[PDB]
Design a binder for this molecule. Structure first.
Ligand SMILES: CCCCCCCCCCC[C@H](O)CC(=O)SCCNC(=O)CCNC(=O)[C@H](O)C(C)(C)COP(=O)(O)O
Ligand code: SF4
Ligand code: SF4
Ligand code: SF4
Lengths: 113, 77, 78, 155, 70, 316, 164, 111, 205, 111
């Protein structure tokens, strides 16, 4: 049975955690297809979402999904993965994979000074 | 003089019973601290009081400052 | 309405203003040149004009405003 | 000889003020927890007849606890002026005495004697609730020994 | 130091043993005139192997390592 | 008559100040303190010193006020609370008013008017919140006050307050009406404005509510009317819902039975004052209007039902 | 069940949990109050009670303060000005001592800094004054303060010096 | 008797007001007689339109006050010959007095 | 027993995380320092501080949701004298991170209100105490200084004792301001010992 | 150098003119509402001389930071977070001015 109390407050429980997690993991995989291959956020984000989605299609139990996601609870990793989806769209807007925009002065990061 | 303290930065958040308390000491290599921010627990709590006090009234807001337990020396510094 | 009365009222508001001498007052007198006014005193006298009349004058219009005949001809056509 | 009658009526008119003195429910301090320790049932307020009334109009004396900062200074004095003219000031705390800590800081008023007339000075960053019970007793005997009807009679 | 009738009255009001565990300390305070306690020395009050360069906690720190960039 | 109104009015002011004295003493005994025993012989001198000291405390005439209404409010509050005491039955009432409990209900509805007059004429926002919550306390208390004063008095069947003395000689009135006594108690806490249902002079809500701008003697008159209302409606709950023994040859045994029952009821009034946390006017209006208004109307229905259920109707 | 329904419907509509709280408040008014009449009965303190500052003395005359200028390098109030001169004796004393009682955090640093234990913090609290000038203890007020309370300080130091 | 106790009570309260006023000293100033909002200059006037939210509960108090005013002659109404008539109709009257609050409690009028 | 014991497994795994963030954000990250106290000091560029903190909050492998601390440390040797820190703290990974950027007092830092509403008050406190403009803040109203206090006080060019000092008068019956001359001068102590303290932290000439 | 709002000096001067217009609009409300012991004319001259105090700067980022500091003074003046004590320490009603000639500065102190 699904949990009545979610273990939190405000973060409401959902009825289809496998469906929302597979659907939003395929959405955050589809967002990184417009990322460049030169960007290594694409490779490491595709690695962590591919390994976690492989755990999702490996296990059908909700508490085993919590134990192999290792993110506390399933609604917490749904919330944090939708923040990761918004981060991937925002970093598509920002493009951080290019090199450093300005070198600092050489006395800026020296301690003690 | 005191302790000659080696330079660098640390910040050690411990459990105050109001919440997070930790001090961001930077040391110049002398016996004086260069600066510290003292982490008030209730600083961000009373920053976020505007969210939790919406849709309520004045006895609820004095109940929520009594709940949240704001004393002000660590917050005003 | 009162196309000469608005000139009487602009002579009234620059008569009630203190920094501008009334013998030096003219309908074609320059503000920043021969009346001793800097770049905020023009804003002061047209803002006194603004609270005297009622209609709003923006600060984008203030820097293009030099002598008030074109703004009273703009406001006199209703 | 009505001078004995004047001094006995002055002691009777100061007996009520020395006994039933009503202070102000103040704050502003690290030191202000010791006002609550005088409120606490070890070293008691109300045994001497000391009641924390929040209004200045109900208050008879301001116990300034502690830290007097520059933003709090017109908020202090606008409250103290609106307290009615039987008014005394106890200054609890070295920040209310002389700017005890934070003396050479930028935004601390250097004692409460800079702003309000302070009748009695209580030292301590802990002033003990015994020590401000001594301060309440010594302000109590100070306004006992003041002689308003006597100086009215030799006027 | 209350009597039995008011003690049983507050035991009826509580259900707890307030007479056994009062909130006011009667004779549970230790005696304030005490023998002088000899405080122990620490682990490095030894005359042999008292070298500060082995126990030197304030010189063992390193300036922080810049790992990757510049 | 003048000797009678002196021995009624001056000992009730002295007993009201001594009620303030034993209020602070049994309140401090609840809060584990000995109380004000220093300044008197076992503390019998402290609110006399308060009433002395607030005379030569400086009064306040502010800029923002209207001074005529500002000074006509506390004198009407003192006249209100000290002339509410005269249709009390006692053994024999000084005013033998034929329908005097409606005068008690009307002047206690007048008792929640001088606080609104004070909270407006003080001309503070704090006093205006205290005045609006005094209006909210009227909205809370007044209809359940009238229905409890109607339905259990329908069992007496007369609004003469003298006829309740002969009704309950051998048995009390809380034995036929036990929910009506506790609901009368929690509504008279709202009329009395004590710390369960005090919501218009509170140090944690506002800066003491409606006594923001009031110093000195007018504050002493408001405190005087406050504690006169405390002992007054303690005597109202005493004279309605509990029945002391009446002997017609000995009213003094009835008066000391009134003394012990009124001292235990004023002790439970200041005990219920110093125990509970203090309300908020949203759930004050909510528990009275949603919960305790149809319970008063339904026990009012059962008091419609009782004299046709049995025994005929009560006498005139 | 029905019994839990009667328990909840007797908790509400009788307010018997409020009667329970009333009786729990009623139990403490028959208790002994914990107050003390303060000018006749005084409360518990300790020998480590840092109170009024005081300058001690050696057991045969001779003011103990040897002008080290280290107790204002530890004082976080910056309250101490101890500008000294030689005594024209060959000894080494102070000509100018100032603590400030209005500054003076009552922190116990100078009573632990002092290498001969000359300044101590004697266990007093009955020194609340009426004017600001009487909490500006220079040298002679401090010396006769320690002369006033020397019989009170020295037994606490004799019972306390194993801890420090 | 009620007139002379109201007269002597308002005269003793008036001389309490006069012994409150004229017995201490008389010295006031503008910072003393400034109004109180924990000691601050007026951000707004106090006499300003307050949009409080217990307004429908306040008018329900006024209608319930009127309802208890028609409920009020009941100890004289119980002394009548038509006991069943006043019984059934007073049952109907206080039933619809409860039913108005039942509709307000249903339609959220008391919030 | 005197020296604190050192656990280097946290040092190498947080150094691997520091190399990870320094590789994945090469535009903004200027360096990453790892101390001996198992914490990371990622020094970045102030034009792009919001990609750095949105990456540190929203990513599943950084996951620093809770901001903790935000001030400057003002070192007047540098051309950009303010050194703005962001101490953040993961609830789930039980780890800490420090983000250090620089600031001049003329070059602003774009604010981080849109990623954390914890810094609705911290950036206002920084605008009081040091005085940097924060871009698109909801309100950058002054908080800790006096109402009308000219001067950011926590910089090194502001003095300890301030410039104004309040005083009541009976000429005007207000708590007026005067330029401060002291009752007692704060005695500046030369607490720097003239001998060399730490040979590891030695400045080259 | 990075800008703040203004890519030149005259756009920031227009922002200074906008802030002066809003300050001149605001100040009779904070004469009438503040119960202040001044007129509006020397208050407006105080606003004008505080504008002329920092008149010498031609730097656009410095005058943009002067624009946000004047906006915070405007935000604490439109709303009444400032009071009658804080709002007119600018007039220096109590502090005597330091003399500018050499002889009085010679007589006053070592400066
Ligand atoms: C009663 C309450 C009172 C409360 C009182 C409150 C007083 C304080 C108000 C807030 C402070 C105020 O914003 C200060 C500022 O705007 S400062 C910079 C002005 N901008 C420049 O300096 C740029 C260059 N602009 C020019 O040079 C102009 O042309 C000029 C008109 C200055 C003539 O300059 P010259 O030629 O003379
Ligand atoms: S004297 Fe010390 S404890 Fe007391 S108010 Fe000042 S800093 Fe706080
Ligand atoms: S008080 Fe002690 S530490 Fe200070 S100068 Fe005197 S002897 Fe030295
Ligand atoms: S007790 Fe502390 S604050 Fe007072 S003089 Fe000694 S060192 Fe200074």
């Amino acid at each position: 049975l699904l949990k009545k109390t979610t273990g939190l407050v405000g973060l409401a429980v959902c009825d289809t955690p496998h469906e929302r997690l597979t659907i939003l993991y395929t959405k955050t995989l589809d967002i990184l297809k417009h990322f460049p291959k030169h960007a290594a956020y694409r490779k490491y984000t595709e690695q962590i979402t591919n390994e976690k989605l492989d755990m999702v299609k490996a296990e059908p139990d909700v508490k085993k999904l919590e134990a192999l996601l290792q993110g506390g609870e399933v609604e917490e990793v749904i919330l944090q993965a939708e923040k990761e989806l918004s981060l991937a769209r925002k970093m598509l807007k920002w493009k951080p994979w290019e090199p450093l925009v300005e070198e600092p002065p050489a006395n800026q990061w020296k301690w003690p000074i | 003089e005191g302790y000659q303290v080696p330079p660098g930065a640390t910040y050690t958040a411990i459990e105050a019973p109001k919440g997070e308390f930790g001090v961001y000491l930077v040391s110049d290599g002398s016996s004086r601290p260069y600066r510290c921010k003292i982490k008030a627990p209730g600083f961000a709590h009373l920053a976020g009081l505007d969210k939790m006090s919406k849709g309520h009234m004045l006895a609820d807001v004095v109940a929520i400052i009594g709940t949240q337990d704001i004393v002000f020396g660590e917050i005003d510094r | 309405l009162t196309l000469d009365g608005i000139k009487d009222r602009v002579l009234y508001v620059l008569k009630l203003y203190d920094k501008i001498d009334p013998e030096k007052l003219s309908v074609n007198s320059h503000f920043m040149k021969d009346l001793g006014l800097d770049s905020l005193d023009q804003v002061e006298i047209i803002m006194a004009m603004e609270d005297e009349f009622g209609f709003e004058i923006p600060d984008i219009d203030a820097e293009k405003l030099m002598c008030p005949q074109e703004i009273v001809d703009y406001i006199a056509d209703k | 000889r009505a001078e004995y009658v004047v001094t006995k009526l002055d002691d009777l008119i100061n007996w009520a003020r020395r006994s039933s003195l009503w202070p102000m429910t103040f704050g502003l301090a690290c030191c202000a927890v010791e006002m609550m320790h005088m409120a606490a049932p070890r070293y008691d307020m109300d045994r001497f007849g000391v009641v924390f009334r929040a209004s200045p109009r109900q208050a008879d004396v301001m116990i300034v606890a502690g830290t007097l900062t520059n933003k709090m200074a017109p908020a202090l004095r606008k409250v103290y002026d609106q307290m009615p003219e039987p008014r005394y000031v106890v200054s609890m705390g070295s920040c209310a005495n002389g700017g005890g800590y934070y003396h050479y800081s930028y935004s601390v008023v250097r004692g409460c004697d800079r702003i309000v007339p302070v009748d009695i000075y209580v030292p301590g960053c802990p002033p003990t609730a015994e020590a401000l019970l001594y301060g309440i007793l010594q302000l109590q005997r100070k306004i006992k020994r003041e002689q308003k009807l006597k100086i009215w009679y030799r006027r | 130091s209350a009597t039995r009738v008011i003690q049983k009255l507050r035991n009826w009001a509580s259900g707890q043993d307030l007479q056994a565990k009062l909130q006011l300390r009667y004779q549970e305070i230790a005696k304030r005139t005490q023998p002088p306690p000899k405080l122990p020395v620490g682990p490095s009050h030894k005359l042999s192997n008292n070298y500060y360069c082995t126990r030197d906690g304030r010189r063992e720190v390193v300036p922080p390592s810049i790992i990757m960039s510049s | 008559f003048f000797i009678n109104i002196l021995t009624l009015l001056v000992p009730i002011l002295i007993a009201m100040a001594f009620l303030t004295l034993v209020e602070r003493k049994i309140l401090g005994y609840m809060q584990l303190r000995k109380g004000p025993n220093i300044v008197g012989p076992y503390g019998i001198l402290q609110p006399f010193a308060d009433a002395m000291k607030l005379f030569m405390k400086e009064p306040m005439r502010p800029l923002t006020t209207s001074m005529s209404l500002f000074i006509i409010a506390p004198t009407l509050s003192l006249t209100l609370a000290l002339s509410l005491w005269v249709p009390l039955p006692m053994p024999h009432p000084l005013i033998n008013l034929n329908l005097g409990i409606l005068f008690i209900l009307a002047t206690s509805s007048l008792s929640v008017y001088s606080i609104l007059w004070s909270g407006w004429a003080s001309n503070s926002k704090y006093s205006l919140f205290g005045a609006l919550r005094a209006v909210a306390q009227t909205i809370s208390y007044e209809v359940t006050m009238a229905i409890i004063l109607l339905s259990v008095l329908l069992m007496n069947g007369s609004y003469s307050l003298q006829t309740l003395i002969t009704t309950q000689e051998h048995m009390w009135l809380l034995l036929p009406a036990w929910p009506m006594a506790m609901m009368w108690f929690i509504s008279t806490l709202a009329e009395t404005n004590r710390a369960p249902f005090d919501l218009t002079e509170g140090e944690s809500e506002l800066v003491s509510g409606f006594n923001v701008e009031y110093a000195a003697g007018p504050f002493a008159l408001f405190f005087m009317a406050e504690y006169t209302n405390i002992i007054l409606m303690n005597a109202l709950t005493t004279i309605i819902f509990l029945g002391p023994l009446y002997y017609i040859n000995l009213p003094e045994l009835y008066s000391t039975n009134f003394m012990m029952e009124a001292l235990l009821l004023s002790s439970t009034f200041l005990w219920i004052r110093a125990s509970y946390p203090r309300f908020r006017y949203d759930q004050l209006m909510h528990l009275l209007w949603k919960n305790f208004l149809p319970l008063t109307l339904a026990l009012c229905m059962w008091h419609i039902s009782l004299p046709i259920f049995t025994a005929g109707v009560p006498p005139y | 069940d029905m019994k839990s329904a009667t328990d909840n419907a007797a908790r509400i509509l009788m307010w018997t949990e409020l009667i329970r709280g009333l009786g729990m408040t009623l139990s403490y008014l028959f208790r002994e109050p914990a107050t003390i009449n303060y000018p006749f009965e005084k409360g518990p303190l300790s020998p480590r009670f840092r109170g009024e500052h005081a300058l001690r003395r050696y057991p045969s005359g001779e003011e103990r303060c040897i002008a080290c200028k280290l107790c204002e390098a530890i004082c976080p109030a910056q309250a101490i000005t101890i500008e000294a001169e030689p005594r024209a004796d060959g000894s080494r004393r102070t000509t100018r001592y100032d603590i400030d009682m209005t500054k003076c955090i009552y922190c116990g640093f100078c009573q632990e800094a002092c290498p001969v234990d000359a300044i101590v913090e004697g266990p007093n609290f009955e020194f609340s004054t009426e004017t600001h000038e009487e909490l500006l203890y220079n040298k002679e007020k401090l010396l006769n303060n320690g002369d006033k309370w020397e019989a009170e300080i020295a037994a606490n130091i004799q019972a306390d010096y194993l801890y420090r | 008797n009620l007139y002379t106790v109201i007269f002597i009570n308002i005269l003793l309260s008036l001389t309490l007001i006069l012994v409150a006023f004229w017995l201490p000293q008389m010295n006031l100033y503008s910072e003393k007689a400034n109004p109180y909002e924990c000691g601050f200059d007026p951000t707004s006037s106090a006499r300003l339109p307050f949009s409080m939210k217990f307004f429908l509960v306040a008018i329900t108090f006024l209608l319930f006050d009127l309802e208890i005013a028609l409920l009020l002659p009941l100890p004289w109404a119980i002394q009548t010959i038509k006991t069943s008539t006043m019984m059934i109709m007073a049952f109907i009257l206080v039933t619809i007095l409860s039913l108005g609050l039942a509709y307000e409690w249903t339609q959220k009028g008391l919030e | 027993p005197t020296v604190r014991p050192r656990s280097d497994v946290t040092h190498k795994q947080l150094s691997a995380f520091g190399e990870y963030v320094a590789e994945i954000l090469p535009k903004y990250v200027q360096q990453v320092q790892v101390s001996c106290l198992d914490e990371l000091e990622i020094c970045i560029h102030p034009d792009g501080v919001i990609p750095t903190l949105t990456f540190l909050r929203d990513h599943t492998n950084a996951q620093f949701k809770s901001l903790a601390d935000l001030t400057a440390v003002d070192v007047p040797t540098r051309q950009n004298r303010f050194e703005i820190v962001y101490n953040l703290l993961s609830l789930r990974f039980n780890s800490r991170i420090r983000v250090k950027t620089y600031a001049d007092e003329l070059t602003p830092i774009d604010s981080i209100v849109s990623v954390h509403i914890a810094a609705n008050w911290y950036e206002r406190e920084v605008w009081d105490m040091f005085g940097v403009f924060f871009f698109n803040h909801p309100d950058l109203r002054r908080i800790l200084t006096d109402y009308g206090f000219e001067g950011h006080p926590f910089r090194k060019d502001f003095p300890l004792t301030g410039y104004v000092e309040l005083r009541y008068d009976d000429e005007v019956k207000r708590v007026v301001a005067e330029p401060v001359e002291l009752a007692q001068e704060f005695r500046k102590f030369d607490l720097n010992s003239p001998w060399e303290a730490f040979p590891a932290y030695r400045q080259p000439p | 150098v990075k800008p703040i709002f203004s890519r030149d000096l005259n756009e920031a001067k227009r922002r200074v003119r906008e802030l002066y217009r809003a300050w001149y609009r605001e100040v009779p409300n904070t004469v009438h509402l503040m119960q202040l012991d001044i007129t509006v004319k020397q208050g407006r001259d105080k606003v004008r001389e505080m504008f002329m105090k920092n008149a010498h700067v031609t730097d656009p980022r410095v005058v943009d930071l002067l624009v946000i500091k004047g906006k915070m003074e405007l935000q604490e003046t439109i709303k009444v977070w400032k009071q009658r004590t804080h709002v007119m320490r600018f007039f220096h009603e109590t502090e005597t001015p330091r003399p500018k000639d050499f002889l009085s500065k010679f007589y006053m102190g070592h400066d």
